[PDB]
Each structure stands twice: as C-alpha cells, then as structure tokens.
C-alpha cells in the first residue's frame, strides 16, 4: 500500500452486478425511511455523488437524521480498542431497509398473539422461549428394508 485515495481497493465492491448496470429502480426513492430504523449501507457504483466509504459497506446502522436528498446513518466502527459511532450522510440509493430486526418483530407478534389465542382456550401459558435445537427423542425406525454397505476397492 503506497497510495490511499478514497476509492483504493474498490475495483470489485464498487463495481455493478453481472446484469445490474443502469439506473436504480424508482422503488428506492419511493421507499420511506423513518427515524431510528435499521438500514444496511451497500455502495452503488452508478450513483457516484454522496457515496459512502468502503468501510461503511456491509455495515448495518440506524438513521440518526432524515433529510432532503440524503439521510444520516450512524454505524459503530472499531478503531483500535474503542468502538466509535460514525455519523455519515448517505444518498438514498446507497441505503436500503434492514430485515435484521424482522425476526424479533415476527416473534414479538406471535409472543403476544399466541398468548391471547391460548388465553381464550387452554389456560397454561404457551412457552415463548426459543430452545436451541435440543437432543433426539425415543424415535422408532424400521429395520426391515435395511441395505448392507461395504467399502469399494481402489479401482484407479
């Protein structure tokens, strides 16, 4: 590394996809971004103006500010020991909405809704704790149609 310009080592990341070259779909501009929502910043090469730096690519963050042409996103960057919030202004095209919290919102809806559904019927509260896989049960399996297996010789 003897040169450190803004776009060094960005030949592949800032490049457009196999068949994505052109102009950004109008959904991006129509999409509504609200304060504090989780966005994911992926730099789009076509729209050079208001581009984020390479570090802030793949990073997911929260919209500190909603402005006119550009939004403001805060992402936490690790420098040495500390992790420091970087408040960056990014054009609408670079920022897309995040489904990182979507799972919790699904679980939160079911958490309250299943509890009410059971509240009308069976009194015991439904368990709402995600168990991590767990082991296996009794499980009976038929042997009758088993296949014998033998290792095959090194034919070459």
């Amino acid at each position: 590394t003897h040169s450190q310009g803004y776009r060094c080592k960005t030949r592949y990341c800032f490049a457009r996809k196999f068949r994505r070259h052109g102009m950004a779909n109008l959904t991006t501009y129509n999409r509504v971004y609200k304060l504090g929502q989780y966005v994911n910043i992926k730099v789009n090469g076509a729209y050079h103006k208001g581009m984020p730096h390479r570090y802030y690519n793949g990073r997911t963050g929260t919209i500190f500010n909603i402005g006119p042409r550009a939004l403001g996103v805060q992402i936490q960057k690790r420098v040495r020991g500390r992790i420091m919030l970087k408040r960056i202004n990014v054009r609408l095209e670079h920022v897309h909405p995040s489904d990182c919290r979507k799972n919790h919102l699904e679980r939160v809806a079911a958490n309250d809704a299943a509890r009410r559904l059971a509240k009308e019927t069976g009194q015991p509260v439904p368990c709402l704790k995600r168990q991590n896989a767990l082991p296996r049960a009794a499980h009976v399996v038929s042997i009758a149609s088993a296949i014998d297996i033998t290792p095959l010789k090194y034919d070459g």
Binding site: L26, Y29, V32, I66, L92
Partner: peptide, 17 residues
C-alpha cells in the same frame, strides 16, 4: 422515461409518505 419520472416524483424524505 424513468429519468423523467425520477425527478417528477422525487420528494425530500423529510416530507415522508
């Protein structure tokens, strides 16, 4: 033309929906 419809429909995101 998507370039024309890009500047005709654009709104500041502060105006929201």
């Amino acid at each position: 033309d998507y370039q024309a419809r890009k500047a005709l429909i654009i709104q500041d995101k502060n105006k929201y929906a």
